[PDB]
């Protein structure tokens, strides 16, 4: 059961695990005049790689720490996405194969990066309460509990980032904007919550617009030409990267420049966007981004994978052929082995900061404290019938959800990390600018303030505009209201049908 | 193997089913203390039990007749979904059980009601290119053909329907209303469908809201409140029946009256909300329905059930005990002699088939799909070089293949053929909701219709001369913010306010 490629290990207690190595499926057709076949996937994404190995790490040095579940070793099941939900539901099939009954079961999953992956994996999981900790899901949808019973996650949801972009357009004084979103279950709530959000603040929208991957030329030509006819400078997109290069490469071969964008953190950092050949058009962003933690060993942890010593990892294969341009046997010149990751730029050893990967290692060590809290456990004072204990040597998995729900832990860097009813956390946002290097030519993404989710309204935004260009050149903020202000001799009047 | 309680029948080619017997499950929550156990359904709804007997009813009149399939009969295997996810994808997983690995397999299903039902069983179902035929999911998120591959079904989409409210309101001149909507994949996109043409056509939103069938005191209560403070009258809701009920009955304790309801059809005929103490909120509510269709013979079918009869279906028990108030034994006992005529319930209580009259056409559907693959020539087939399926050993896939280039004529004289988006066209009637004098109870009348196959500003027909306005009134009423300025006078403006609100302010002396 399950696919072909995966990362697998065996021990007492097995871990799920849900990440995408590729960026997407093939643009085909199957008019079925034969027998359907299973697609194939495109792109190769280094990023998601990088994710992989945080879970590894956190689960080899839970295995390695003989305070934290002595006597007992953790094993994983990793598979891949595609960014599709048909790929993420024929995993889950296998996650829950015992279950709707030789595989051992699972007890915690790792969930999946996009929101309506992260749905559809948990309408399946909720059935045998598997719980499942997400790492990069922060849609609203997710909150509710009459429908997704046995989900949590490690980042906050999408309502404070609406609320700061409409802060930044009422502290730069705009009233004259437009939106654009996603066609998902992530992209379309959040605009929402920042339509209504700004109708509040007297903040008029000119035109709204949906994208998808997969738009065909007759729904990016109208959706360009929509852009070109206002007179709004301000855009705010509620996208990711694959969502957004579409639109992206028509914008850039249209050569459409003076527009201001406020990006969500999808594509804040995304490194399909921020390339130095769209910079007279993407230059000059503002966006949102995530506190960073910290993981002593695990550079060189990143720096030692191997295609024939990762005997666990079926991934390490295809990760060394792409990056060398080399082909393996069990054009393309053949490998040797020896070849160095340090010399090639990718978005692999290549970072600044770590967001998710200190995401996906918190939700490992979430559930190994639960565990942990599992074991240590004194009869008549644990949390179940009449007070009782669950026996770590037959432990399930409703088990370990219980004590999810009531988890309390401080982390490696001392703070408590605990979840809220809905199984949310609460944290701070950092804003970003994006400049140009001046030595290297690549883009260099600067802080420019921060968002406080603890201070009272009113008093969280926090910019420092003496650090903004507006559009990498620019020291002047740009004008985006509708109309001039009227003077003491004059007044105001009505336009029919304009707002 | 799945639920217990079913209804199956052998046969050579097996269809699948989903409707929903009842309206929803228990309001009890764990807290995990012990294992969870299984969750159950809590009331009946007799309008999901004739939907079912028309799939039966379809299926048997195929097997009785020589012409459509010959030497083959078609058995079934239907679940209830209570309108619940959990419930819905249990049936599924049963559905497929076979090809996950004895287990006969599942050609076709005929799919759910809600669309988040739809949509859930969709995700699954499409991995194995089963083909799924909806008889009342009309969202347009379901036309996406790059994620729901073998997806149909015989309802339009609610786009239209938006078009058409925003329509009838621009009819009906007003420019100061309001929105509410369910918090589901159905309320969603076609009430942001209908602020955008709402906006288009200069007309001003004041509110809008989310409700749900589980909220909790708090949001009605702030709901209700939004909806006293506006003075907009006329409100206009996308939900169904379960998901409006609670805010309705808060509305008539507190005796709200006055506001004229635009409904859409999935409530618009909903037995929860047309009571006669309702009345005086709702009465007078302008809605949507469907076209009606004829099923000679379908009356004395649905009159002949029984619950010892009826080897095949597993429901008639609990639909007898239900009828009659009884308990059956294997709250007095059964007899087992009484009149279905008795009792008056939805179930023999209508009027026109809208809804039951789409699994009719589904059942149709899939049978000439499979007529055609019967009968066929070699070197003239939708397959590769020419050539045909077989019928004794036929797949899902072929199944699927031809219901996508199928055209067949209906029993009354009319052609059915499926988009390339799987979905169907078809008008609407307009009705409003009146007060019967002879017995208390309320009374849909059509006053016009919406002639989908014209052109953009010729669709809509209304009488204004069968209309009551509030059930007893005659006159049309007013909601615009703002009193019309009279003559040699000059707008204003009121700073805040969006511009259908203004002041009124007189002319310079020297102009006019
Ligand atoms: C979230 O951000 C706020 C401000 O950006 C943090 O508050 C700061 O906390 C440090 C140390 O406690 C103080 O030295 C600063 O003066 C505080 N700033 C302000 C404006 O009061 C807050 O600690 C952050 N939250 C977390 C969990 O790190
Ligand atoms: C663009 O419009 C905004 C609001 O429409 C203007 O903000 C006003 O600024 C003045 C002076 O700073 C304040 O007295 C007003 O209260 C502000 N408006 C509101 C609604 O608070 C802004 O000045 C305009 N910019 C330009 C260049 O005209
Ligand atoms: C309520 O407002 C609407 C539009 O704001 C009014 O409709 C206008 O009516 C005048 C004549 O009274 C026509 O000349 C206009 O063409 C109408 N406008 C539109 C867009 O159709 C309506 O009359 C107002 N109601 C009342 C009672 O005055
Ligand atoms: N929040 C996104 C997922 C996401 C977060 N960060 C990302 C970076 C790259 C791609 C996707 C993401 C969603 O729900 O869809
Ligand atoms: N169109 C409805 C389905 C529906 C039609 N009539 C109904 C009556 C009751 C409940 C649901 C319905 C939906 O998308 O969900
Ligand atoms: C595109 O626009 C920029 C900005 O004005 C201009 O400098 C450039 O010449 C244009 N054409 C290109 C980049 O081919
Ligand atoms: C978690 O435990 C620490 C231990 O002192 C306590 O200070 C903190 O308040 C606890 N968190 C919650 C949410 O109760
Ligand atoms: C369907 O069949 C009828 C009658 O054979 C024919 O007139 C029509 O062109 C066919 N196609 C469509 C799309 O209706
Ligand atoms: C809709 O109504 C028009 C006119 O009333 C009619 O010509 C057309 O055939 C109808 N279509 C359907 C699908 O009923
Ligand atoms: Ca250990
Ligand atoms: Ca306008
Ligand atoms: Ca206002």
């Not at chain 1, 194969?97 to 992260?118: D, E, F, M, R, W």
């Amino acid at each position: 059961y399950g696919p072909d490629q995966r990362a697998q290990k065996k021990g007492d207690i097995i871990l799920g695990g849900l990440f995408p190595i590729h960026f997407g499926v093939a643009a085909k057709d199957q008019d079925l005049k034969s027998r359907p076949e299973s697609v194939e996937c495109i792109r190769y994404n280094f990023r998601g790689f990088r994710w992989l190995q945080a879970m590894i790490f956190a689960i080899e040095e839970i295995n390695s720490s003989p305070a934290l579940l002595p006597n007992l070793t953790l094993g994983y099941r990793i598979f891949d996405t595609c960014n599709t939900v048909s790929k993420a539901l024929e995993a889950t099939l296998s996650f829950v194969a015992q279950n709707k009954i030789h595989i051992p079961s699972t007890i915690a999953v790792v969930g999946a990066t996009g929101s309506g992956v992260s749905t559809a994996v948990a309408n399946l999981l909720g059935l045998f309460y598997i719980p499942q900790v997400s790492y990069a899901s922060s849609s609203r949808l997710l909150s509710n509990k009459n429908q997704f019973k046995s989900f949590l996650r490690t980042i906050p949801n999408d309502e404070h980032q609406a609320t700061a972009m409409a802060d930044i357009i009422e502290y730069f004084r705009w009233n004259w904007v437009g939106t654009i979103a996603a066609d998902d279950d992530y992209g379309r709530p959040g605009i929402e919550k920042f339509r209504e959000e700004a109708e509040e603040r007297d903040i008029c929208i000119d035109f709204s617009e949906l994208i998808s991957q997969y738009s065909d030329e007759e729904e990016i030509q109208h959706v360009v030409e929509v852009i070109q006819n206002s007179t709004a400078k301000v855009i705010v997109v509620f996208s990711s990267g694959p969502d957004l290069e579409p639109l992206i490469k028509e914008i850039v071969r249209r050569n459409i420049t003076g527009k201001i964008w406020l990006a969500s953190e999808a594509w804040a950092s995304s490194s399909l966007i921020a390339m130095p050949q769209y910079f007279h058009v993407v230059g000059g962003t503002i966006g949102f981004a995530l506190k960073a933690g910290q993981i002593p060993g695990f550079r060189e942890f990143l720096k030692k994978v191997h295609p024939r010593k990762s005997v666990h990892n079926g991934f390490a294969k295809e990760f060394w052929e792409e990056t060398f341009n080399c082909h393996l046997q069990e054009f393309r010149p053949l490998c040797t082995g020896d070849e160095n990751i340090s010399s090639v730029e990718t978005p692999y050893i290549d970072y600044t900061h770590l967001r998710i990967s200190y995401n996906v290692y918190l939700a490992v060590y979430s559930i190994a404290h639960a565990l942990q809290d599992i074991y240590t456990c004194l009869p008549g004072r644990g949390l179940f019938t009449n007070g009782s204990c669950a026996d770590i040597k037959k432990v399930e998995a409703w088990q370990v959800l219980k004590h999810l729900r009531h988890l309390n832990f401080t982390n490696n860097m001392g703070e408590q990390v605990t979840f809220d009813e809905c199984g949310d956390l609460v944290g701070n946002y950092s804003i970003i600018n994006w400049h140009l290097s001046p030595e290297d030519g690549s883009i260099v993404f600067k802080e420019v303030g921060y968002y406080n989710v603890y201070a009272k309204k009113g008093e969280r935004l926090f910019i420092n505009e003496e650090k903004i260009l507006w559009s990498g050149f620019s020291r002047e903020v740009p004008f985006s209201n509708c109309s001039r202000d009227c003077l003491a001799g004059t007044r105001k009047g009505i336009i029919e049908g304009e707002p | 193997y799945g639920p217990d309680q079913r209804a199956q029948k052998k046969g050579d080619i097996i269809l699948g089913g989903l409707f929903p017997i009842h309206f929803g499950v228990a309001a009890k929550d764990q807290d995990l203390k012990s294992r969870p156990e299984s969750v159950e359904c809590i009331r009946y709804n007799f309008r999901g039990f004739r939907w079912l007997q028309a799939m039966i009813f379809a299926i048997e009149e195929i097997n009785s007749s020589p012409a459509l399939l010959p030497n083959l009969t078609l058995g079934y295997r239907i679940f209830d979904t209570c309108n619940t996810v959990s419930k819905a994808l249990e049936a599924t997983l049963s559905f497929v059980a076979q090809n996950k690995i004895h287990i006969p397999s599942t050609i076709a299903v005929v799919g759910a009601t809600g669309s988040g039902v739809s949509t859930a069983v969709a995700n699954l179902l499409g991995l194995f290119y089963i083909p799924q035929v909806s008889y009342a999911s009309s969202s347009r998120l379901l036309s996406n053909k790059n994620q729901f591959k073998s997806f149909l079904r015989t309802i339009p989409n609610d786009e239209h329907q938006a078009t058409a409210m925003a329509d009838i309101i621009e009819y009906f001149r007003w420019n100061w209303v309001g929105t509410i909507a369910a918090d589901d994949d159905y309320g969603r996109p076609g009430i942001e469908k209908f602020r955008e043409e709402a906006e288009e056509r200069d007309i001003c939103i004041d509110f809008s809201e989310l409700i749900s069938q589980y909220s909790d005191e708090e949001e009605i209560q702030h709901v209700v409140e939004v909806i006293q403070n506006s003075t907009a009258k006329v409100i206009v809701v996308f939900s169904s029946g379960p998901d409006l009920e609670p805010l309705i009955k808060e509305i008539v304790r507190r005796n709200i009256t006055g506001k004229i309801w635009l409904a859409s059809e999935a409530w618009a005929s909903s037995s929860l909300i047309a009571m006669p103490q309702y009345f005086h909120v709702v009465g007078g509510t302008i809605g949507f329905a469907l076209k009606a269709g004829q099923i000679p013979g379908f009356r004395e079918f649905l009159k002949k059930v029984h619950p010892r009869k009826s080897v095949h279906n597993g429901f008639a028990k609990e639909f007898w005990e239900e009828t009659f108030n009884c308990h059956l034994q294997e709250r007095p006992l059964c007899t087992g002699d009484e009149n279905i005529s008795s009792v008056e319930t939805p179930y023999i209580d209508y009027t026109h088939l809208r809804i039951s009259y789409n699994v009719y056409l589904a059942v149709y559907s899939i049978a000439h799909a499979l007529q055609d693959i019967y009968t066929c020539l070699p070197g003239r087939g939708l397959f590769t070089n020419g050539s045909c399926a077989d019928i004794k050993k036929v797949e899902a896939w072929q199944v699927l293949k031809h219901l996508r280039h199928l055209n067949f004529t209906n029993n009354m004289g009319e052609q059915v053929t499926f988009d390339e988006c799987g979905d169907l066209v078809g008008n609407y009637s307009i009705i409003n909701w009146h007060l019967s004098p002879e017995d208390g109870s309320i009374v849909f009348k059509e006053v016009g219709y919406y002639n989908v196959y014209a052109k953009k500003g010729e669709r809509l027909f209304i009488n204004e001369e069968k209309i009551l306005w509030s059930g007893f009134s005659r006159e049309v009423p007013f909601s615009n913010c703002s009193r019309d300025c009279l003559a040699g006078t000059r707008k204003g403006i009121i700073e805040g306010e969006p511009t259908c609100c203004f002041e009124c302010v007189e002319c310079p002396d020297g102009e006019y």
